[PDB]
Design a protein around this ligand. Structure first.
Ligand code: GTP
Ligand code: MG
Ligand code: PB
Ligand code: PB
Ligand code: PB
Ligand code: PB
Lengths: 166, 309
């Protein structure tokens, strides 16, 4: 196989932890998933690629830790709670601080507009406006609305990322 | 210098008509995501969650101020309707024949967020009442001569606690550990707002000057302002940054953030801001909630990496 590092960041309560579970085998999956504490290294295989996945906390306190993994990251999955319009700018700021950081290389970023299933959810196009994804012009990036409960769209995304990773 | 804030979200056509004391945020529904609580001039109690209005409610009287100890507790006339979670629960009333002028909270033990807390009431009669951690019973009654106009509670009820009291007679009284201090300050003009900062209290007198005062009486600094003070509020950032700032909104439309003496941020809201709240709202800890004279709801949030040094 081929081993790659995927950093999964994004604000707290976005469904970072849940989205990764839908990449785990149906029996391996967890019932209730709990607010990630500190961070977690997991593994996922997909085809000829084996993803070494770092699930960080997005809590205020822990946001300081993502920079610890920027240097190594080969791809980043950024997660946004599509119904949480309020903290959108905050997600933008953190996203920017990441891209700016001199350790985060020009690796593929896949943005999950997660929680597509909610009534108040923001549409992928209105989100990429807020985070200003349109301005990112040096990296492969792609936004993909998802439902992490069901795994709806998760495949669509990971597949995209793996295409950039080959 | 410039504005330190992040522009969260704005609703120009909210229907909100409250000044600082009737606005509050807490964890009503315990599910972590805090809600905005407003005792509007509509004699209505509007409730905001996230970025849209959740419920409106009808209110018996037009309300003085609302706090939380969680149970929202509106004060008006002589009643204090303690709703809780969020359905009616009590109608505690002042014993002698009294009207309420201002109300705030004291931490009972922990001096930590979401701790045991006890309601604190000023009455036009001239008493300050501290109540049971339940709210059921009056715990302390300290009588002081002047009419209370606004108050700031700094400390913890068991360890040590001080309350600074803005009298309508343009004077500052102090109460340390239940005992009423003899140090009384002659303010320059009538008090407009009163904030607890780090090592001292800040008054905004009507003549557009914020004064910083030590309980001993010392005048730490003075902020002389280009316009008129409409609202003042404590901005308490915890963490590595650990600063207890002061927010002033002026009728010229600017809102300024002072780190002790030093001006750290200024921005200008389209309309003069009549109510300021800074706290956790939603899932972000450092959020500036602003209610304009035009009834708009403006929400901003302090970046993780902003310095106030
Ligand atoms: N409606 C809906 N709920 C979701 C979705 N994804 C996750 N949730 C739930 O909403 C909450 C989000 O929890 P987490 O997945 O742990 O949030 P996180 O992104 O991992 O961030 P951390 O707090 O740092 O662990 C949990 O209740 C989730 O299981 C979704 O796609 N739709
Ligand atoms: Mg997580
Ligand atoms: Pb697939
Ligand atoms: Pb009011
Ligand atoms: Pb209050
Ligand atoms: Pb003054």
């Amino acid at each position: 196989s081929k081993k790659v590092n995927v950093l999964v960041v994004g604000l707290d309560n976005s469904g970072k932890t849940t989205i990764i579970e839908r990449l785990k085998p149906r029996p391996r999956q967890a019932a209730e998933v709990a607010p990630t504490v500190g961070f977690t290294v997991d593994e996922v295989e997909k085809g000829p690629l084996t993803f070494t996945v770092f699930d960080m906390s997005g809590a205020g306190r822990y946001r300081t830790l993502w920079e610890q993994y920027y240097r190594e990251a080969d791809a980043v999955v950024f997660v946004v709670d599509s119904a949480d319009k309020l903290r959108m700018v905050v997600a933008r700021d953190e996203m920017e601080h990441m891209l700016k950081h001199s350790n985060m290389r020009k690796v593929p970023i896949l943005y999950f507009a997660n929680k597509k299933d909610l009534p108040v959810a923001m549409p992928p196009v209105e989100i990429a406006q807020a985070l200003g994804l349109d301005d990112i012009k040096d990296r492969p990036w792609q936004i993909v609305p998802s439902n992490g409960l069901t795994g709806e769209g998760v495949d669509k995304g990971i597949d995209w990322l793996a295409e950039r990773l080959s | 210098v410039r504005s330190v804030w992040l522009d969260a979200f704005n609703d120009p056509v909210a229907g909100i008509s409250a000044y600082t004391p009737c606005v509050h945020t807490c964890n009503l529904f315990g599910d972590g995501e805090n809600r905005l609580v407003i005792a509007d001039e509509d004699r209505k109690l509007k409730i905001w969650k996230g970025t849209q209005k959740a419920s409106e409610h009808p209110l018996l009287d037009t309300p003085v101020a609302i706090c939380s100890y969680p149970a929202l507790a509106v004060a008006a006339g002589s009643h204090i309707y303690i709703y809780r979670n969020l359905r009616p629960y009590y109608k505690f009333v002042l014993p002698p024949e009294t009207v309420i002028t201002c109300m705030d909270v004291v931490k009972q033990a922990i001096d930590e967020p979401d701790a045991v807390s006890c309601l604190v009431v000023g009455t036009e009669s001239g008493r300050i009442l501290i109540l049971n951690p339940a709210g059921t019973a009056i715990v302390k009654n300290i009588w002081v001569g002047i009419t209370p106009a606004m108050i700031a509670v700094q400390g913890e009820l068991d360890v040590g606690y001080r309350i600074t009291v803005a009298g309508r007679d343009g004077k500052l009284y102090h109460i340390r550990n239940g005992e009423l201090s003899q140090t009384i300050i002659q303010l320059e003009a009538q008090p407009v707002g009163l904030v607890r900062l780090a090592k001292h209290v800040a008054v905004g007198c009507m003549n557009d000057v914020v004064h910083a005062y030590t309980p001993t009486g010392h005048k730490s600094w003075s902020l002389y302002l280009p316009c008129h003070i409409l609202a003042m509020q404590r901005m308490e950032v915890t963490g590595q940054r650990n600063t207890k700032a002061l927010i002033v909104a002026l009728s010229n439309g600017e809102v300024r953030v002072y780190n002790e003496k030093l001006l750290v941020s200024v921005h200008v809201s389209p309309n003069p801001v009549t109510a300021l709240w800074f706290g956790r709202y939603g899932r972000e800890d450092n959020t500036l909630l602003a209610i304009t004279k035009s009834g708009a709801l403006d929400i901003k949030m302090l970046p993780r990496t902003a310095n106030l040094e």
